Design a protein around this ligand. Structure first.
Ligand SMILES: O=P(O)(O)OC[C@H]1O[C@](O)(COP(=O)(O)O)[C@@H](O)[C@@H]1O
Ligand SMILES: O=P(O)(O)OC[C@H]1O[C@](O)(COP(=O)(O)O)[C@@H](O)[C@@H]1O
Ligand SMILES: O=P(O)(O)OC[C@H]1O[C@](O)(COP(=O)(O)O)[C@@H](O)[C@@H]1O
Ligand SMILES: NS(=O)(=O)c1cccc2c(O)cccc12
Ligand SMILES: NS(=O)(=O)c1cccc2c(O)cccc12
Ligand SMILES: NS(=O)(=O)c1cccc2c(O)cccc12
Lengths: 514, 514, 514
């Protein structure tokens, strides 16, 4: 069939043809953020068609009533296509908690006033509530009260997303006094970031307790936890969600210097990571951000967890209907490291071209998945995996290995919680992974793991349990075919259990497509 | 000293620390394009300080007199710093030939008029010189006369850089008739690209014969040959430059579909390749461009030739003083594949922030060079190298291998033509490669090869030839030290010859820095 | 030149041609043991011609006067060929200390009497000196007095080299009582081995103090230390040899179960290891011996120390003038793991065919060295080597790497202590390593390290030190040529120092053979 791949990564690279068409499948999910440009039910319907799999609601701005109208919409459109059970794509919702902040007071007493900070001028920073609504050039008010026990001398404060830096000269309780390093106009209520620091602010703010608690009532499918410093913050979110929402998946945003520095414990606490390049690139030097992303996707692949990758991905596509080259080869380049799914923010929320920005992330990811150098990635992922006695693990590795050798067009897996699928995707198989579930929710959170293309079975449960398995498999063939992942007389791997239940997948059969 | 690097590329990735400071050296050159924003001698002086190594003059717009004033400037600034012979960086000039084009005539007879093309409307394209200066919606004039023997039915024509596509329906000599696929306003004298085609236009245009011939008179250091389809075009440029400019280095721009498809022969004809992402991304689908870049840098590493990499690299830094994340991790990502040096266009020619855009390409490249996974790249580059009897080759590989093992802070190489250096850089040593030449020109074209940091010796030739070698080495120590590539009591590898001449490098010594 | 070697070890194997003639060089030394069949000066002369490099004197049997006549001979023959300074091979001597033993007394009072031990019969073992010279079937006397504090219940005793095993049933001080497991006739004064045990006998016996002390007076080149259990035994030998013989190289024989179990510390104490398959295969089960050999040569390659490999190598060549296949592919198979030199015992001491047994170990080793899979062995030996700042190390790795690439016919190294050579051989270069020394002793102990082919320079020291180096190199060319390791216009790597002394090798030149 397909000829033997290159013996080395340099040989591999050199052989990349651009006349070679890719598979119809696309292995990395696409998360859109929903805003003004894309809250309408016509737009959302049209987006779902283009390849959107996670609608992400941004709980920074807008009221609880405003978001509910958005979810109501996302669902109306998701559920339009559910007449034809074969062609129905399911669609996750996700809630992006606002997080902790430090904030500036009202400058000169006004609502929107400007102050010029020079490149050497001295600033006292007072935590007394008298100077807010009378903030000047000389005296600034910080929202954060506990700053002086955190910030040491030399530690810089970045203001208004790093437009203004300033270096701390002397701290004497109630006030720290600083020399300003970067200049420009300052406003009122503008966010403060203090690099290299261990900030003490509460893990969930007062606002974000109502938000998470709102999202369990609204039945969201995952929560994107903002500003995560310790494993204990991730454990706080898990507490608030409570046993009523104990399924909801927590994805921590790594956002600050401390977050990176303690990455390894946060991972062992979350259900997946988001690399939030936006904020990360203020709290540490922009020229380094690239390394933190690589590192993180790295460790997340080894651990087997999903890593979303976010922010500024196709930024120029707010204004112009085509991206720049940089934007093209940044998307392709996350997808190559093994980002699990990728994020559009401004481009889908606010831009003139929401449909295009999706259609573009579709095409790009798709070609890039065909450039991955499997038969040296796979071989490394094996060496780095523990020898255990667990049937499900053994079957899932075997199923991947087979898939290579027979060039198989898919891997049907019957799931229930999703875990059976999740193991297969831990190996990055070249074939797509149709997973076939009854649990409507399992279907939605599958969109995180790279590879898995979930399908929801509505067909009511047969009497004889063996015949209920044979019904579900045959669904997954009729779905693969009407999509184009294989034809008749092709070859598919099918994972299955031996009894009914969860956690008894042990059988891997290799069947020709009927 | 430095601990043993990871056993695998996934292990490697996972270990990338962001608290680990990089080497003071920077291995990939920076090419600025000189325009209005950066023709002044104050700006250029300040740029050279930031890390510019190739000034690229763009022979599209402007007259011969206008460019000469630019070169005169580049040189005045280059030569400012040549009082202090240790701290003098040399600076290449490079000439970007305009190339062949196809062009539209004057619409409606006017200088600047607009015509709306709909999404299905029919167009005749006439090559009769009557319809130019009277071009309408229905009839368009093409500069190219020989189009009908090239373009077949189905082949699309992209107009105004792909704003307007149109598909060819019937060709009947003198005129081809088309259905328009993409809509929008069209102008007068706007460039035509015809994908998937083998275009017959002359290799050097009439204009570009005067340009190349101008650049030999002005003593440029390399020529960036635009629109290169065959090895015979590259051979045409080499003819025109003549024996008077037989040193000048030809870098072919790969720009069209055919260029890629025949890459392998063009390489064996040029002195190095430029991947010109700008144009490449119209002539083929934007989602594929990434693969053509990888492929090309790939093959160029194996062949040992330099590959420049160009266009849209830090595009947003025309308007705002910081890049987007995409722009950051696109620069880092060329540098990781093994782009040899990188290009700023708009950002340096036209933008508000030319110095910043350089300072940013400096910092980025520098961190990214410290993330390269050497002790599996090096090992592959060996396996893929021919066993030959040539002393110079054997010494250069040995010198690299040593450099690994002793963690050596540099590799001094005494050159003359440059070839001795060029072999060492063919291995991508982690250490910088100080090359020490008398030939002022060799010094300028060193900036192409990745790693090489050339220094020009002015100290007059000693009597005893052994003592002339010892003078040159000691220069390269005093230069490495005042830069920071090593201290006293560090360890450097020094390549040298046995007789004087060219092509007798055979000795590799390993010395402690005095 | 020579085509690129296979990408994998299975591919490698499959490509082994038997029509491909090997290099004239032979990289693994040959140690003969000198006995009756080969003490004559005619035989020894003829042996030296065949390829003997270490004469090993066996200090078990014979008096001090008898051995001295043997050394006197070995030297007379070594020194016959020293008229022609180019063709003179130097020849090490080596002393095999008898070691500790446990021994049986005189059976039935007689000099040579027989006793039948059945397969279940009970034996008391008494340490009272009354029962010796009256040893029976029921009561046996052991030389070892301290046995009962060492041997526990279950520990088997092997007698007469494991002809008779017996298992210990009850130990009650002064006597242990046993059930016999293997049957056959027993004699008087026949050696006892007690498996799995930590034996307390002195490191150097009373006899072996006179022997070592004899060997320093006779100026032997290394000592083969027998029965080595701890690093403290190896440290005892080093004490006895004293500062008068502080150069003499100690090679520990690993011989018992404990020896293997503590291998790692013994290595860090000795100057090289001998795997003594003879004895090892009684003290542990014969089917395991193979693994202990592999393991040991293994660790010794990583540590960079030489491993001799011994015993039963060509055993059938005592009686018949050709070996069995097993004997052929056991020699080839040590040489492939990376045994550093190999031992003939009976075959050279006692056999009818001493010259043939050498000529056979010559031919075999030689073909086998051409089957080693270098360009995956070398690459592993690098990864497993520490990054240090030591010039000599860096030069020696570089020199090996070069040698690969230019297919170089030799590596001349000017030594003095030998250490410069020893580093190069730590990499297993395919080329032979001519080392050129003035120190006549350094020349003799070079025969241990695999690869090194030492040559002794007699030419008196020139005035100008640079010209003294150029004299020594040119010797090493005239020696390589008259041997056949290269011709005119071939290519050789030459390591050298920068000052005179020891430990300043830093220069690696790559020269064409004059
Ligand atoms: O991914 P999970 O949660 O282990 O689900 C696997 C289960 O799915 C099945 O294949 C299908 O059975 P169900 O009818 O219980 O879903 C079981 O045989 C198996 O144990
Ligand atoms: O890179 P090239 O052109 O081979 O130059 C290498 C030459 O440089 C030298 O080291 C310096 O000698 P020169 O004085 O002739 O430059 C020669 O010994 C050697 O052959
Ligand atoms: O193997 P060793 O003991 O380091 O000997 C290396 C020495 O040999 C030499 O090359 C030869 O010099 P000598 O005349 O002192 O032997 C020195 O330059 C060098 O340091
Ligand atoms: N981009 S890639 O396909 O080269 C790649 C991505 C992730 C991990 C890899 C690995 O562990 C080994 C080789 C390539 C990898
Ligand atoms: N970016 S990188 O360091 O992983 C790399 C770049 C070019 C070639 C490589 C290769 O041949 C093998 C591993 C990594 C490479
Ligand atoms: N016999 S061999 O050439 O295959 C060999 C011997 C010793 C070590 C080796 C190694 O580390 C890797 C491959 C082959 C080896």
């Amino acid at each position: 069939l397909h000829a033997a791949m290159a013996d080395t990564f340099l040989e591999h690279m050199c052989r990349l043809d651009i006349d070679s068409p890719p598979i119809t499948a696309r292995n990395t999910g696409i998360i859109c953020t929903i805003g003004p440009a894309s809250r309408s039910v016509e737009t959302l319907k049209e987006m779902i068609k283009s390849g959107m799999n996670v609608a992400r609601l941004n709980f920074s701005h807008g009221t609880h009533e405003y978001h509910a109208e958005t979810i109501k919409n996302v669902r109306t459109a998701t559920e339009s296509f559910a007449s034809d059970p074969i062609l129905y794509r399911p669609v996750a919702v996700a809630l992006d908690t606002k997080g902790p902040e430090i904030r500036t007071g009202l400058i000169k007493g006004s609502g929107t006033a400007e102050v010029e900070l020079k490149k050497g001028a001295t600033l006292k920073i007072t935590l007394d509530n008298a100077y807010m609504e009378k903030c000047d050039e000389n005296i600034l008010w910080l929202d954060y009260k506990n700053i002086c026990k955190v910030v040491e001398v030399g530690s810089k404060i970045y203001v208004d997303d790093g437009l203004i830096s300033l270096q701390v000269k002397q701290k004497g309780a109630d006030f720290l006094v600083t020399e300003v390093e970067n200049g420009g106009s300052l406003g009122s209520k503008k966010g403060v970031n203090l690099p290299g620091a261990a900030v003490d602010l509460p893990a969930v703010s007062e606002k974000d307790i109502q938000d998470l608690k709102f999202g369990v009532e609204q039945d969201v499918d995952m929560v994107f936890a903002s500003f995560i410093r310790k494993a204990s913050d991730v454990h706080e979110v898990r507490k608030v969600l409570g046993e009523k929402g104990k399924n909801i998946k927590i994805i921590s945003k790594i956002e600050n210097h401390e977050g990176v520095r303690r990455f390894d414990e946060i991972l062992e606490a979350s259900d997946g990571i988001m690399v939030a390049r936006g904020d990360l690139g203020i709290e540490i030097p922009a020229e380094k951000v690239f390394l933190a992303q690589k590192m993180m996707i790295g460790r997340c692949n080894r651990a087997g967890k999903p890593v979303i990758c976010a922010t500024q991905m196709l930024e120029s596509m707010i204004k112009k209907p085509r991206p720049t080259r940089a934007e093209g080869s940044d998307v392709a380049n996350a997808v190559l490291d093994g980002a699990d799914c990728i994020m559009l923010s401004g481009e889908t929320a606010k831009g003139d071209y929401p449909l295009e920005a999706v259609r573009m992330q579709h095409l790009i990811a798709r070609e890039a998945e065909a450039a991955i150098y499997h038969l040296q990635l796979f071989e490394e992922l094996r060496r780095l995996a523990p020898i255990t006695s667990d049937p499900t693990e053994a079957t899932a590795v075997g199923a991947v290995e087979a898939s290579f050798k027979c060039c198989s067009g898919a891997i049907i897996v019957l799931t229930k919680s999703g875990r059976s699928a999740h193991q297969v995707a831990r190996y990055r198989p070249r074939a797509p992974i149709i997973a076939v579930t009854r649990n409507p929710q399992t279907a939605r959170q599958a969109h995180l793991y790279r590879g898995i293309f979930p399908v929801l079975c509505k067909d009511p449960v047969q009497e004889a349990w063996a015949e209920d398995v044979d019904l579900r498999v045959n669904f997954a063939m009729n779905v693969g075919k009407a999509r184009g992942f294989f034809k008749k007389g092709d070859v598919v791997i099918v994972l299955t259990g031996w009894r009914p239940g969860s956690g008894f997948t042990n059988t891997m059969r290799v069947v020709p497509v009927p």
